Design a protein around this ligand. Structure first.
Ligand SMILES: Nc1nc2c(ncn2[C@H]2C[C@H](O)[C@@H](COP(=O)(O)OP(=O)(O)[C@@H](Cl)P(=O)(O)O)O2)c(=O)[nH]1
Ligand SMILES: [Cl-]
Ligand SMILES: [Cl-]
Ligand SMILES: [Cl-]
Ligand SMILES: [Mg+2]
Ligand code: NA
Ligand code: NA
Ligand code: NA
Length: 326
DNA sequence: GTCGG
DNA sequence: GCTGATGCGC
DNA sequence: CCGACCGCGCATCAGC
């Protein structure tokens, strides 16, 4: 929080471009700037100083000067006053409602939490569950709770098939003291890039977790990716825990390292690493890292035996999970 | 909105 | 039904 | 300047 005021300002700007303006590149431009500044070990004294960092250009430099001089930004002040922008920004906070849906609802007169509640019929499945747990999904998850959650997930998975390997990734693997949700990477020997010898591998696990009442709702579910809701069990007479978002990704067992790298993040770290990969002539996804031929077409998967091998290919020193929070 | 060639 | 584009989210 | 901006699973829709 050394330059919290500035990073918060850029984040709000980023959210505006994304939610209201539907300008994804500007969104990421602001996010990159916020990121590099949050990483900066000094208390910024001027926009000129900030402009030295990659990602911070003229426009943002001017904004930082204004914020330092007055403690605020007029551009944001006007945005906050705008009701449409405010309404669209708010609605996008519901899981399942993005910029388009948010602008459409506002067009229909639906602009508040109360409005959504009296219009459930106009929401799809995902949006309905996001509204249901709106309050809860805004809460943080203490690492202590993440630990109890990990215990339940790993043990239940083990009960279905001892050959399953469940790994909690996301901010948790990065060592965060609190997480916004739980991210679970899952592998099983019968599912490789070479073949699928067993169907319902992901289904079985989801099923088991619902059986024990851990998973309470489903936002989306396919053969390899589950997106839903879970809840820790509470003791007698005590208030129950908030419901939490849970994502489970089944990845070919032989592509574990690319999968755990992807699912460990951060999202900005992944974007930076994938972009660097390209510059180095490689393309990276959650499955593999491939060289880019002369034409720029991806070649065959390169051998990977650790997360480090991936870093080595793009000529980056290895970075522990805890140092990938950008 | 920012950057490299 | 399928395929492709688009919205959404990780 | 100006083209590039990471890469992809699932739900939903149009058009067939
Ligand atoms: N390449 C890529 N990977 C992504 C992206 N978004 C997410 N990931 C990958 C990297 C992410 O680390 C991982 C998990 O996604 P979460 O949204 O849960 O992100 P975190 O868990 O990091 C925290 Cl925001 P928390 O949940 O605790 O608040 O998915 C994206 O746009 N691109
Ligand atoms: Cl844009
Ligand atoms: Cl791998
Ligand atoms: Cl691939
Ligand atoms: Mg997460
Ligand atoms: Na700069
Ligand atoms: Na949303
Ligand atoms: Na997640």
């Amino acid at each position: 929080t050394l330059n919290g005021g500035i990073t918060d300002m850029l984040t709000e700007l980023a959210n505006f471009e994304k939610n209201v303006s539907q300008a994804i590149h500007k969104y990421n431009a602001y996010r990159k700037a916020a990121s590099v500044i949050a990483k900066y070990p000094h208390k910024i004294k001027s926009g000129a100083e900030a402009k030295k960092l990659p990602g911070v250009g003229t426009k943002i430099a001017e904004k930082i000067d204004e914020f330092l001089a007055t403690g605020k930004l007029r551009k944001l002040e006007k945005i906050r006053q705008d009701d449409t922008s405010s309404s669209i920004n708010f609605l996008t906070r519901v899981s399942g409602i993005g910029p388009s849906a948010a602008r459409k609802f506002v067009d229909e007169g639906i602009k508040t939490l109360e409005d959504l509640r009296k219009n459930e019929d106009k929401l799809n499945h995902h949006q309905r569950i996001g509204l249901k747990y709106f309050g809860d999904f805004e809460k943080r998850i203490p690492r202590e709770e993440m630990l109890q959650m990990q215990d339940i997930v790993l043990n239940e998975v083990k009960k279905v098939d001892s050959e399953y390997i469940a790994t909690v990734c996301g901010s948790f693997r990065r060592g965060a003291e609190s997480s916004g949700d739980m991210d679970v990477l899952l592998t099983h020997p019968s599912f490789t890039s070479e073949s699928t010898k067993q169907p319902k591998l992901l289904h079985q696990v989801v099923e088991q977790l619902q059986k024990v009442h851990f998973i309470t709702d489903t936002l989306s579910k396919g053969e390899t990716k589950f997106m839903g809701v879970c809840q820790l069990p509470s003791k007698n007479d005590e208030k129950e825990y908030p419901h939490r978002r849970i994502d489970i990704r089944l990845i070919p067992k032989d592509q574990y390292y690319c999968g755990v790298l992807y699912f460990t993040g951060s999202d900005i770290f992944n974007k930076n690493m994938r972009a660097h990969a390209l510059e180095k002539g490689f393309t990276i996804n959650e499955y593999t890292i491939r060289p880019l031929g002369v034409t720029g077409v991806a070649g065959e998967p390169l051998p990977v035996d650790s997360e480090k091998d991936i870093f080595d290919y793009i000529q980056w020193k290895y970075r522990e999970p805890k140092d990938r929070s950008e």
